[model samples]
Target: FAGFLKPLKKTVLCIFLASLLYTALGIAGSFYIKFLFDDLIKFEKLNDLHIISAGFAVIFLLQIFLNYYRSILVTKLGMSIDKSIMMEYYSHVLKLPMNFFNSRKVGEIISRFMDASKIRQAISGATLTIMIDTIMAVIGGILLYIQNSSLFFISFIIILLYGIIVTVFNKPIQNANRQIMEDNAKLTSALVESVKGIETIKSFGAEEQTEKSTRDKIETVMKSSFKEGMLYINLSSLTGIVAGLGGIVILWAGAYNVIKGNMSGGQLLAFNALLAYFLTPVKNLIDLQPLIQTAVVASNRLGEILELATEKELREDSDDFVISLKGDIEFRNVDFRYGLRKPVLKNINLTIPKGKTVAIVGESGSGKTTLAKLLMNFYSPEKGDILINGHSIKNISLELIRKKIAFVSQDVFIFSGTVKENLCLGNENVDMDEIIKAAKMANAHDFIEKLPLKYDTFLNESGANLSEGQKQRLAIARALLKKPDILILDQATSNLDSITENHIKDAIYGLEDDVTVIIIAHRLSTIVNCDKIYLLKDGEIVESGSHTELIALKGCYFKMWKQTE
Candidate 1:
């Protein structure tokens, strides 16, 4: 509330001034109606007619201006509040930890944020207008009562009774609306998932099942929405009925007082006009109650997103010195786990010298990929540390560490753009010669040149038109473009054919003398010439040596190599 008020103070003040002007004009206009009826018609005052006509004209004009100003101020304040709150929410979401995203559905988060923003707009706009209107109604009613207490008391009872009934009925209406919102979210999630996985459904020939599921979700949402709408319609009807009844009863009582000589005809007319004008604002305030409740619910959803904790990015330190890495990496007593349960890597120790090629060979569950993830700091170790050129991986700035490394995985993901755009992912200002060289190095240049537009050719989402080997080569070409100091090939060539694999090997073997490579090899033949081989078993490095030395040792690597051969 404090944050909202701070930015909206000026706008709020303008709205307040407009409301006061409107209310004053409304009271004057109501009195004029009575004056016209009694003074001009009954008392036979011909001269007073022109003066009352002018007064009515002036009040109408004043109301028109006040209404315009009120709208302008209220809308401006509402939009300003919405924008400020959304910005804070977006910034907070960006800071939240990766685990938050991993655990929650993307659609749910998006729906919640959108709903919250809408709610904020409704709440801010309705709150300001309703508050002003409610105050005007109360003040006008009290002033009318001072003139005629008996009439005021009777009208007050009617309004109070109606308000109580409306309030009591609104509870169920609010519950139904909330349920509708939840069902709508679920339907949206289902629709999004169906669209995303349409290809899978088509391939499996389960289109009928998919359609049925989607229909079910849509029907559920429709049912909830229909139920809520019915409740709202009933509430609106009830309010209208009660307001109409109250107006009729007040008019009847005021007419009886005039007939009995208890009140003057002018006073009775004035009282009835004032009562009607007073109820206008009160009626509007009552109508705004449901809107206010809906907005509150939406605000709560948005607040949840804003409250999520964000991951902190690496901050720049006072030291501006850059450390030249020798490309040597060391893992000392490294231990890690995805969560708090069993550790993935235990007391692991390994070292690779500069310009050396090391391969970690292990079965599927032996933690080969986890070791690579640890080195890249994708997931920090639960215990111990990894060092790159003697600097602790954890202590080094993430940006600097990332700049020094390149990772090419078996699962290749390509963004939608031209071939050149994908190749320029590592460095936007890539030289033409370097681009061609890197493509050639990855055995991608030949296939790329075959395309009608060559490097300028556009690729669809995930490079849909490209073959598996083509995608792998594109990924390799991107990595090579970085000219990284340390290259970690995590199952890089697993998707390539034997012929393509040989070409990739030749390209890798031709790398500059300064580059250090770490390969997670699935095929024994690919790592035959590696400078060092680390054979892992059950999260432990069971054997480590050169190809020949490991072969001579007849350990895990040798045994595995023999079996494959």
Candidate 2:
């Protein structure tokens, strides 16, 4: 937060200067009332009423002007700081490693944005008042002392009591606010999970179960919110009680002083009028404690994420690439696992020459997808290294490596947009003719043409408006438009029937000779025509050969092929 404020030092300084004038004007207004009662009224200066009225008008307008000036500067500072902090937070989130996202919910990540709003609120209107009021409170104490030391003593005691009340309620309000924020984040995460899995929930008749889980999270949030509300209520009530009692004591003491002739009637009247200006700032400051506490909690939450290492930082020591990739890929003795879990890929070595197509076949959990993820650099190998175009991935730039390769997965994420928009997603420079050609190549153009708006037809979220096969084809077309040097399809055509799958496969195999293709598949029939096949069992490759060679060997690949047949 301090680093963010560095850029706005000039604005902050301006705000400080305006606040000083604003405070001076406010105190001047209070003192003018004292002058009216003590000087004008006591002397029976009735003829000077117009002069006094004119003086009141000057103070009134000047106070409004200074207040407006200070508010504009404070708002400008707040909005600038808000924009700066939000941008930095977003940039850091984007640069985080994929594993960070894999372990957190989408809504949980989104909920962190609320912390940014909290900070903005902390420094805006109420915060400006708190700072200015604190200054005014101190100045008012001096005035009170000048008038009468005994009344000043009473005012100081009242402020001390307010401070004590704030201190007593601070930790409880903070605890409850933190709890509310956490429960709200969990509730957000639950809602997002439920929305994403709505189809599964409906299919399994688990609506009641989902509702119960979400309701439970809502209940926790409510309980914490109730606790925080009660704490604030108690805090405010205590401060109000002290303020009321203190004001009465001051009135009684001032009246006694006046009757004893120690204080004049006009002086006591002016003193009562000045007390309004004095007590309000202290009371408001006391009331603002919950907001300040919440900001502290929000700051801690934001700091936790900023402290984590981003992916860019993790690879900061690696060299960046200046040349285009030629698509020669190899995994050299790779061993990888998730956290401390058993290895997913173990001591594996495989290579695909440039201008070749290869297939990895395996049962579920056989580490086929893990190999593709390793190629994409989604995870770094715990041991050994990967190479692209004979250069170790550690030596090449991560950004450049990904730029030359395109991956199409079975679970396609289709944004809600026109057909053409979805197809030309990342490759913004692609022309209409190229988009149509890629769509045709992926066997998606025909259905797209049949739609009412053709290329302009809008698709729904997750492509719910289209068949699974259509979504897969659209994904392939999107990948093709990138004109990547390497393309990996991870069960991308699983939803398609054999006839449609074969057509899509033929288009993929017919890609430019320079494009290296890696296919991870469960349907052995689909990969029989591949230039080479590697069969993975458990965490290791048990067989590697051409289809004909593997069939003759009567090994794991052969047995798997026979079962599929």
Candidate 3:
């Protein structure tokens, strides 16, 4: 709350001042009621009545103007909070390590964007009015006390007891709000998952499964929502009932006092006139607490994203020095695990010389891809360090390391934008020459040039305009445009047709004499010409050599080779 409020302090202060003035006018208006009744009416002065009535008219007009500015301040404050909180949440969430995402679902994160607005409204909207209304209540309390202390004491006692009674329901209302948020998260996750997997669901003939899955999530949310709504109803009903009794007692007691000459009829009417200012504002202040508490619930959840662990801050050895990568890479006795005992890579010591094509070949779940992730610093080694150019990646900044290296996986992702927009991701101000050069190298230039708008062609639905093979080349083109010193191609051409495969393989070879290329090889033809290959199996490298040298040994690599043969 403090963080979100810092930027909007001026706006909030304006609202606070305006509301106090608004309340001040209400207090003045109530005092004028006393003037009209106790003084002017008892004296039967028409001139005094006319003057007080005009004063009432002016006070209300001031209040309307105050209310208008108060609303503007509230909206500006809310929008400020909305803008900052969402960016802060998004920025912090992006920096959070890979493990942070592994444990959470995508749909759940998307739902946070919507749920977070409740937190903003709870603070900027409800809390704003609550404070103003609190001031109005205090002024009205003073008026009621001034009229007759005994009557005021009765009302205050009943209000105090009502507050205590509502306190009993506070914990349950908060719990219900928390339950509602959770159910909504689950329902949102279900909807996103169902939509994303609709084609898969159709292929498996599981439309009924989708319907049931959706129904279960929706039903859970509905049940929790009903419970939350009931809690709200209970709060409103209790406040309304207690306020009714208090109003009746104030008027009833005042009437008796007037009949006995303890108070006058004009005093009774004036005291009753101010009762609304007292009870209504007080009831709302209490009722609004529930909304603020739910914001606390939403806040606690959103705040968790900001609090999640991320990589270390940027550190520099020399201000003017930039790392020029010649990719002399190593994994020195590195050990990694996703769990307490499920080792992904164990005591791995591997090397890739600069300007060399190095291949890591292994069967599925043999930690081939995990090795690439370690090099990328997506996950650091549990023990030891991965190095580039004799600098431990742990000691190097992520920005610096990433600038010198790029990775392209088989499952390419395209942004929903123009061709230039996608290419600009590699270099934000990438030129046409470099774009065309990288595209031609990846064999995507011809297709791109033939398009209606070329680089400006807009892609709909993650490049639904292009085929899988076309998208794959385009991703390679993106990586190439980065012009990194080291390029890691992990099964990049494994699914392409021979024509496309040869085109990509040619591009890989084209970079071999300059940039170091690391291939997580699946096909023999792609890695046969490598400077060296490591045969990894069950978290260890069992063999290491050139393709011909490994086959000659007729060992583990040979057996694996024979199967592929």
Candidate 4:
């Protein structure tokens, strides 16, 4: 509710005023009908009848105008609330630590945000309106009861009983609705995974198995939805039956009073008409129960996300200095693990002086990439500290760290945009000449220029139009454009041919003297000229020296280098 009102107070006020006017008009219109039937029809005065009819027409038009204005206000409120929540959620999710993404599936996270938006709309529009309408109906019933205590007491009893019944079943209905939403999210996850891996499925000839699994997930979703729907239908049916019975009882008692001369025919007719008006709003109120239940479950889910501890940005006003780094990095006695189990990196201590190139070689699962990630501050060490130019990395802002470093990984991702657009990304003010230079440095400019639209040629989603080598070159160009002080290459040239790999290697060697380079190499030949090479085994740095020095040691690095040869 706080999220709903924080950004849309004015729109909410407008909606409230409009709803009040609309409700008042409806009540007045019903009473006007009573007046006409009981007084105007008895008098048969045509002039008086003309005045009453004109009044009714005026109020009817006013009612229509009020309804229109109310809709406009509620819609504006709903949209404002939705926009605010989405923006807040986006910022919050982006700031969350990498561990959060690792723990949660991408599809489920997206569904949670979407579900939250829908629930916000339901709460702001339908839920609030139903609550307001029900309150008005209750007030109207009291007014009617004041006119006739007997009828009011009996009708109030029926409403109270209905409320009790709904309250008793509310928890179960809400639990069932939450289950339905969870099942829907699961089905969405399966569909997303299957679609994303469709090419792999075809290559492996597992289409039939994948389809069968997807169908089973769909069936589960449908079953849960059906069960929730049945629960809602039963509740609605019971509420409707109670309302019908209450109306019948009112009609019978009113007729009996009329026959006994305790009430006039006109009064009984007016009472019945007002009772019908009152019941309509009550029915609407009852019908909103399922929506309310779903919204509560959705709210809880959203709350869970919002309550996560975000990584706070380091304060700029602190004593930390912002200056050009010398590119010297050190990991001292670093021990780390994902959970409370065996360490992925244990007692790891290594250093790279300014302007030096270091290569890390290890078997698969030997934590080479993990060391790179720690150097990049993608994750923090559990038992040691990482220092950049003698300053603790944790004290610096992530943005600042990124500005000083660049990474080109083997797996590249491209958004849907033109070649130049993807190259520039959100850095609109970057120099076009520099962009072209970076592309040339990565040996991507020649191919990009040969395209149909040249640099303006749009790439399909994920750069589907480009080959693996071309995509790697583009990623390298992007990183080069950042002009980083430290460059980390994570097997960036692994899948490319020798010619393309040489081009990238030459580009790296041509960098300014002050730039530091760290390479995680699968092909040891590519890093043979590096100033220092570290060999990792079972999450520990078992050997370190120049390529020839390590070969002399005849350790893990030498063995792996031989295997690659």
Q: With candidate 3 superimposed using the best TM-score fit, by how many Å does residue 351's alpha carbon deviate from the native?
A: 1.5
Error of 2 at 7 (Å): 4.7
TM-score of each: 0.81, 0.92, 0.92, 0.92
What's the alpha carbon RMSD for model 1?
4.4
**Which residue runs does candidate 2 get wrong by more than 4 Å?**
1-10, 39-41, 141-147, 260-262, 307-309, 315-324
lDDT of 2 by residue, 1-565 (tens): 7875787788777767766676666667666666776787557787686687678769878877877877787777777767776677777787777787788768977777775566566757566676668666766767777877777788888889988888888866776777777888899889988998999999999899989998899998898888888888888889898899889998898899899988876667667756765787767767578666657666655665555445558755666754756658888888878779777776788877788778887766777778888887788788888888777877776676666688877677777887788778877677877777788788877788888876788787855467777777888888777778788877766677763676566575557545677777786777776777777787876766788988999977677768777
Superior by TM-score: candidate 1 or candidate 2: 2
Residue 147 accuracy (lDDT) in model 3: 60
Q: Model 4 segments beyond 4 Å from truth?
A: 1-14, 40-51, 131-135, 138-142, 307-326, 426-428, 561-564
Between which residue pairs do clashes occur in model 3?
Answer: none
lDDT of 1 by residue, 185-278 (tens): 7777777787778889889899898789879988988998788777767777777777788778777888888888889888888888778666
Of candidate 4, the 10-residue stretch with the lowest lDDT total is 309-318
Number of the candidate with higher TM-score, 1 or 4? 4
Residue 299 Cα positional deviation in candidate 2, in Å, after optimal superposition: 2.4
Q: Highest lDDT, which number?
A: 2
- Scored against the true structure, residue 345 in model 1 reaches a CA lDDT of 80
Q: Over the stretch 1-565, how does candidate 4's per-residue lDDT look in tens digits? A: 4956766677767767777776667667767777777786677777887788789778978978877887777667667766876677767777766777788787787777767777777766774566467556765665676656667765776677678767666767877777777887787888788888888998999988988987898898899888877887888877887788888888898888889888876778767766765666667657667666756766666766555434434123233555645558887888888778887886787777777777877655777678778876777777888778877776665666676687777777777788887887635689989898888888877778778878888787664467677777887788778777788877767767764677666576667536667776666777776677766777777766788888878876667668767
Task: Give one clash count per candidate, in the order shown.
Answer: 5, 0, 0, 0
Which residue pairs collide in model 4, if any? none
